[PDB]
Amino acid sequence: GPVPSRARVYTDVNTHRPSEYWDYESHVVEWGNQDDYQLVRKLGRGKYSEVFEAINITNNEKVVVKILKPVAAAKIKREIKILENLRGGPNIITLADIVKDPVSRTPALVFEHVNNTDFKQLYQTLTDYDIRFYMYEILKALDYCHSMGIMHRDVKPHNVMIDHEHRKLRLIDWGLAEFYHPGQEYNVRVASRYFKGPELLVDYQMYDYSLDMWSLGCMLASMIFRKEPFFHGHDNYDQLVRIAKVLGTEDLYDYIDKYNIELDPRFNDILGRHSRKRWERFVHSENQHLVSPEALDFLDKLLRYDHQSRLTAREAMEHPYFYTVVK
């Protein structure tokens, strides 16, 4: 069968913390007062929750309320335990309260409000320096959560809120996050299509923190190359073919051979034979202002098939790409 895998970092974090830390099922939720919050406007609805801009009437401060759908209401102790564990961590969204919504009869998570700058506006105007700056901020959140024995599993642009005026960034939506336990087989049905790591696309279940590093690399490639999304698959199968057209099929076969993984036979008639492309192929006059040899070297070390071969978040922070960032 498949060869086992374990993270190269933070492998022992959940065994050396008390069981109360990771055993989310045993956690007793401390319910707050739903009357403290007045819903103001519906911001959006996803598959797992309805999101509202609200006001905390006990302090007159803006808050964000996530009213969980019943499908999310089952795995809420996991999200709550993760949010409580990571609270106060660098660039981690702050869970302010947990209340019972009187209408939905489900939990509503109350978060600090972030006056986020419009996503299109940030993608279209962030400078080379700003991309480095904000990428370093995201790395602080990922190294923190990984050091805390947690993988986000849904790193993507919409889960990174930026208040550009205050140079403030928060990593949000911890609903898909999990505790990392060496040897555990996880569900591969995580992350958004364009950000799914090759381990998910080849159904390799014994993955770890490094999945977040692939997703981060997909965001960086889209940002510096002005190509949204960078790997533009029609479905989960074409998603792997899109990756193979850039990294090449030879390294993909070396990856699946190393882990004794068998590709779905449906890849026999769609994968083809592709050489690895040099990152310079993606540079053009409209993105050259965002590209540098250090950006390309950094990206090359995130976007690797072998999950054990990608930079870790702490190693990534040491990369020359960040030397210009004021610390």
Ligand X SMILES: Brc1ccc2[nH]ccc2c1
Binding site for ATP: residue ranges? 43-51, 66
* Segment interacting with ligand X, rule: CB under 6 A, options 14-22, 126-134, 195-203, 250-258: 126-134
Task: Count interface residues toward ligand X (CB under 6 A).
Answer: 15
- From ligand ATP, ligand X, none, interface partner of 162 (C-beta below 5 to 8 A by class): ligand X
Q: Does 201 bind ligand X (CB under 6 A)?
A: no
d(CA 243, CA 320): 25
Q: Does 157 bind ligand X (CB under 6 A)?
A: yes
Q: Does 119 bind ligand X (CB under 6 A)?
A: yes
Structure tokens at 45: 């609805």
102, 34 Cβ separation under 8 angstroms: yes
Binding residue positions: 43-51, 66
Partner residues linked to 67 by β-bridges:
50, 108
Closest contact distance (angstroms) between CB of 113 and ligand X is: 17
* Segment interacting with ligand X, rule: CB under 6 A, options 25-33, 129-137, 239-247, 271-279: 129-137
DSSP state at residue 66: E
Q: Does 46 bind ligand ATP (CB under 6 A)?
A: yes
d(CA 152, CA 175): 8
DSSP state at residue 92: B
Within 8 A by CB and 6+ apart from 315, the residues are none
247, 187 Cβ separation under 8 angstroms: no
Catalytic site residue from 154, 173, 208, 212:
154
Helix (H, G, I), strand (E, B) or coil at 308: helix
Q: Does 56 bind ligand ATP (CB under 6 A)?
A: no
Task: Tell me the one-letter amino acid at 205.
Answer: Q
- From ligand X, ligand ATP, none, interface partner of 228 (C-beta below 5 to 8 A by class): ligand X
**Catalytic center residues:** 154
Q: Which spans of this chain sit near ligand X (rule: CB under 6 A)?
A: 119, 122-123, 126, 131, 134-135, 138, 157, 160, 162, 219, 222-223, 228
